[PDB]
Amino acid sequence: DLRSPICCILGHVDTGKTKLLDKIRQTNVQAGGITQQIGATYFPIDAIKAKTKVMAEYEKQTFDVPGLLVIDTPGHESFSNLRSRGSSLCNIAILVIDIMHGLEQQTIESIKLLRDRKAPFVVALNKIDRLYDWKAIPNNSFRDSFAKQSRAVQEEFQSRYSKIQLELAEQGLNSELYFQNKNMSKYVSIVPTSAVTGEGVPDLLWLLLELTQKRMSKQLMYLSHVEATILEVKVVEGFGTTIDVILSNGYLREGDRIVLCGMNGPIVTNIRALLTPQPLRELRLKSEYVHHKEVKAALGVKIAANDLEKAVSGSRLLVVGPEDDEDELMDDVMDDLTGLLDSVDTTGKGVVVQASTLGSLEALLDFLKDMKIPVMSIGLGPVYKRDVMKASTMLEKAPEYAVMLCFDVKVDKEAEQYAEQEGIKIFNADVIYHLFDSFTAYQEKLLE
């Protein structure tokens, strides 16, 4: 019937997003069936019902979708694919904000990322239990526990919340509590949360269900064509190169013929194995993985197959069924990469760019297009000496354009030394915006 929605959690360090995730993950004693998958964890709808029971006191409950899928992996893997395709990787985003700290640098970074991404999101106001002399009711709804609290506590909460709402107003986005908010489009919804007590978690889950079911009912339907995107390319012993992928829709089976985007060219291979993590320590001891002859959306799965090393993160994966043309499909999957590649001119004066994923590369090229800096070549995966040579060619005619913009990429020591001696400039940042700031700083420092 319906397709399970995908949730992603992003916040400044020590906000409690991991702890919150663990609280939601917590085994329910009554339900159950929550499985840790590769790059994600899945919650069956019954477990959510069990967790969202108290929300019956304030809101109408709907449980149409089979489950909720959230992404465990730290960072921004949920945005490794193109923004148009982005809906597949992340239906809704959870921005965790410490009610104590309020807005922080990584928070503003994440906000800007979401605005560029045009991705819908809600904010979780975590650490509310830390409010002075807060009396906690484990796993209670927010409004109930708030009503339970003393006037002093309510006033402290109101002060901090008002401050944070003001800070969000500074970033240009209007914010309101989820029940108070009239329109989701204009106002972002705040749900106060405590990852330790579990307070607000029912509100959060209910809100996710509401937004995803109502707004994304349109977005999430069942499709017989496969829908999947590669979160990561990782090397696992006994399998060589494997790809960790989120299967948003459809069925994947062993022995399937699949085509995926690759740096040099399109990759075609047959699935040798479909793998999921194994919870039981005793069984995990024999083998770290469980094999599935067939796998059904929505879940995060590790795919083992030939020629996976060339694979690019963020790329969509297509299965050629009978009556389908594999070559046509290769062009189809490659279309995003080619689409980005064309924007760069192999012939002309430009800078060199290297990125980890398609989405990061997209954001980079968008930034350069805005700043009007031309790009001669595009790079994916680890930086090598040749990639630096590409920039080295620019040195004779234009010293200023002989630079490398690299995001979330690993640079070889040989490449590092070569660039060091040659005088090429390499920009590398964990955060995409850090690279923007440092780069503009470099341009203005060369401008003087």
Residue ranges in contact with ligand GDP by CB under 6 A: 11, 13-19, 126-127, 129-130, 194-196
Q: Which residue is nearest to Mg ion (CB)?
A: 18
Rounded Cα–Cα distance for residues 210 and 60 (Å):
9
The single residue among 2, 14, 18, 320 that binds Mg ion, judged by CB under 5 A, is: 18
Cα distances from 411 to residues 311, 342, 420, 421, in angstroms, run 18, 25, 12, 15
Q: Which is nearer to ligand GDP, 127 or 143 (CB)?
A: 127
Rounded Cα–Cα distance for residues 77 and 244 (Å):
11
Instruction: Answer yes or no: are the C-beta atoms of 7 and 94 closer than 8 Å.
Output: yes
248 binds, among Mg ion, ligand GDP, none (CB under 5 to 8 A by kind): none
Secondary structure of the chain: what % helix, strand, coil (to 5)? 35, 25, 35
Instruction: Give the 3-state secondary structure of residue 383.
Output: strand
Q: To the nearest whole angstrom, how small is the minimum distance from the Cβ of residue 71 to Mg ion?
A: 12
Q: To the nearest whole angstrom, how small is the minimum distance from the Cβ of residue 120 to ligand GDP?
A: 21
Closest CA to 355 of 334, 371, 375, 373: 375
Instruction: Find the helix or strand (DSSP H, E) in which 312 lies.
Output: none
Instruction: Answer yes or no: are the C-beta atoms of 199 and 139 closer than 8 Å.
Output: yes
Segment interacting with Mg ion (CB under 5 A) among 15-23, 136-144, 181-189, 206-214: 15-23
Provide the 10 A C-beta neighbour count for residue 4.
21
Q: Which is nearer to ligand GDP, 126 or 392 (CB)?
A: 126
Residue 366, annotated as binding a ligand? no
Q: Which is nearer to ligand GDP, 13 or 283 (CB)?
A: 13
Residue 126, annotated as binding a ligand? yes
Q: Describe the crossing of helices 358-371 and 432-447 by its angle, rounded to 10 degrees.
A: 30
Residue 286, annotated as binding a ligand? no
Residue 196, annotated as binding a ligand? yes
First-to-last CA distance in the chain? 61
Output the six-digit token pair for 137.
């009711």
Residue 128, annotated as binding a ligand? yes
195 binds, among Mg ion, ligand GDP, none (CB under 5 to 8 A by kind): ligand GDP
341 binds, among ligand GDP, Mg ion, none (CB under 5 to 8 A by kind): none
Determine whether 141 is exposed, middle or buried from the number of CB atoms within 10 Å of its CB (0-12, 13-18, 19+): buried
Q: To the nearest whole angstrom, how small is the minimum distance from the Cβ of residue 157 to ligand GDP?
A: 13
Q: Which residue is nearest to ligand GDP (CB)?
A: 16
Q: To the nearest whole angstrom, how small is the minimum distance from the Cβ of residue 106 to Mg ion?
A: 11
19 binds, among ligand GDP, Mg ion, none (CB under 5 to 8 A by kind): ligand GDP
Residue 127, annotated as binding a ligand? yes
Segment interacting with Mg ion (CB under 5 A) among 16-24, 131-139, 339-347, 359-367: 16-24
Rounded Cα–Cα distance for residues 295 and 95 (Å):
30
**Sheet with 351-355: strands ordered across:** 375-380, 351-355, 403-407, 425-429
Residue 259, annotated as binding a ligand? no
Residue 33, annotated as binding a ligand? yes
The residues that touch Mg ion, with contacts defined as CB under 5 A, are 18
Feature table: binding site: 14-19, 30, 33-35, 126-129, 195-196
Residues of the binding site for Na(+): 14, 33
Known binding-site residues for Mg(2+) equal 18, 35
Binding-site sequence positions for K(+): 14, 33
